[PDB]
Design an enzyme around this catalytic site. Structure first.
Site, PDB file in Angstrom:
ATOM      1  N   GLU A 117      12.800 -26.516 -10.811  1.00  0.00           N
ATOM      2  CA  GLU A 117      14.156 -26.024 -10.662  1.00  0.00           C
ATOM      3  C   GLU A 117      14.242 -25.257  -9.359  1.00  0.00           C
ATOM      4  O   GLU A 117      13.405 -24.391  -9.083  1.00  0.00           O
ATOM      5  CB  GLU A 117      14.575 -25.130 -11.814  1.00  0.00           C
ATOM      6  CG  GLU A 117      15.862 -24.398 -11.518  1.00  0.00           C
ATOM      7  CD  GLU A 117      16.354 -23.642 -12.706  1.00  0.00           C
ATOM      8  OE1 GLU A 117      15.560 -23.441 -13.655  1.00  0.00           O
ATOM      9  OE2 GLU A 117      17.537 -23.257 -12.698  1.00  0.00           O
ATOM     10  N   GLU A 201      26.103 -17.297 -13.005  1.00  0.00           N
ATOM     11  CA  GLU A 201      25.500 -16.853 -14.260  1.00  0.00           C
ATOM     12  C   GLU A 201      25.985 -15.439 -14.554  1.00  0.00           C
ATOM     13  O   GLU A 201      25.584 -14.494 -13.853  1.00  0.00           O
ATOM     14  CB  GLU A 201      23.975 -16.887 -14.171  1.00  0.00           C
ATOM     15  CG  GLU A 201      23.401 -18.271 -14.018  1.00  0.00           C
ATOM     16  CD  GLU A 201      21.891 -18.267 -14.075  1.00  0.00           C
ATOM     17  OE1 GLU A 201      21.252 -17.842 -13.095  1.00  0.00           O
ATOM     18  OE2 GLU A 201      21.340 -18.668 -15.124  1.00  0.00           O
TER      19      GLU A 201
END
Length: 220
Positions: A117, A201
């Site tokens: 990631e 986020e």
């Protein structure tokens, strides 16, 4: 398109959007992702949220993504041109603003969402932390970043974090991939790029709005 449900989803003209309230169970609040524009030259959208509880738990990752019909080997990718313009408003914001990319060698990667990631944090609001530990400061694509290295389950997670917020951003993401394969052992001819996404986020705060004036991205 107003996307308030936990996984409300829209796609048009090569881009997709997901409200993606995956962490809603670790606190309490509400969130709605509104699509303002979705064209082959780029997208525009915003998400409104208020979140409480689970101080250091991500409540959601609302994003827009570029549709990737072929998952290409990183070593086969000539460039990943991308452009992002965003702003935040609201009180007591604890949230990030980040590119999110995932790669894996096999399509049937079982116990995780990808072998690797790769995040690029353009925003870091309040005391919020990426996964892993700092390995210092690096210079990639005309900017200095604090690089974090760690694991989220099986997934090796590299986070390039901007030391001050960058509200308008233009880069070629393949240069971050180049940095990783030249210096951190990333296997460029084994990993296929699965996902190119951009969003926020949230941890806590609000009523807040994350505004995306423009996002575009391609995998060439």
């Amino acid at each position: 398109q107003q996307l308030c449900e936990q996984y409300g989803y829209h796609a048009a003209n090569g881009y997709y959007f997901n409200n993606n309230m995956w962490g809603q169970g670790s606190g309490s609040g509400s969130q709605c992702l509104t699509v303002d524009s979705a064209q082959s030259g780029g997208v525009s959208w915003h998400v409104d949220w208020q979140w409480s509880g689970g101080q250091n738990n991500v409540k959601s990752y609302p994003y827009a993504g570029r549709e990737l019909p072929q998952k290409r080997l990183v070593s086969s990718i000539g460039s990943i041109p991308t452009s992002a313009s965003w702003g935040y408003s609201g009180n007591n914001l604890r949230a990030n603003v980040a590119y999110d990319l995932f790669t894996a060698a096999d399509p049937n990667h079982e116990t995780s969402s990808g072998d690797y990631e790769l995040m690029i944090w353009l925003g870091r609001l309040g005391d919020v932390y990426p996964i892993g530990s700092s390995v210092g400061f690096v210079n990639v694509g005309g900017q200095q970043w604090e690089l974090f290295d760690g694991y989220n389950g099986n997934m090796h997670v590299f986070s390039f974090v901007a030391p001050q917020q960058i509200n308008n951003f233009n880069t070629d993401v393949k240069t971050f991939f180049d940095y990783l394969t030249w210096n951190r052992g990333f296997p460029a001819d084994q990993q296929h790029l699965l996902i190119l996404q951009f969003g926020t986020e949230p941890f806590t705060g609000g009523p807040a709005t994350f505004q995306v004036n423009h996002f575009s991205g391609q995998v060439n």
